[PDB]
């Protein structure tokens, strides 16, 4: 199946967000990223995607379709607004082995606060 995500300047959680920011999927599913406001893109974060998965980076303002194959957790960002908190977490399959690692990894404070909310109040 396909899951649609929008990139916006302002959403429910504040400025610069992915909606939804928590995406549950299975291998073979697609995630379609649609920039409803200009200036956004999607890029996998180094050391925060499963072992065996390929890194990716979309073009700004382009609709992008990600096919997820490896199970595990993926943290993605908008290349431009990462430091302002613009991230989404993709959970492929159950009990993603690398989730606790991703939660502990170094990242901007604002990112950490949103991630913690998405994992709790959005799981
Ligand atoms: Cu952005």
Swiss-Prot record:
Residues spanning the membrane: none
Binding site for Cu cation: 40, 78, 81, 86
GO terms under cellular component: periplasmic space
Cofactor comment: Binds 1 copper ion per subunit.
Induction or repression: Under anaerobic growth conditions and by nitrite.
Plastocyanin-like domain segment(s): 5-93
Locations listed in the record: Periplasm
Keyword line: Copper, Electron transport, Metal-binding, Periplasm, Signal, Transport
Superkingdom to which the source organism belongs: Bacteria
Gene Ontology molecular function terms on file: copper ion binding; electron transfer activity
Listed cofactors: Cu cation
Keyword presence, Electron transport: yes
Function text: This soluble electron transfer copper protein is required for the inactivation of copper-containing nitrite reductase in the presence of oxygen. Serves as a direct electron donor to the nitrite reductase.
Name listed for the protein in its UniProt record: Pseudoazurin
Organism for this UniProt entry: Alcaligenes faecalis
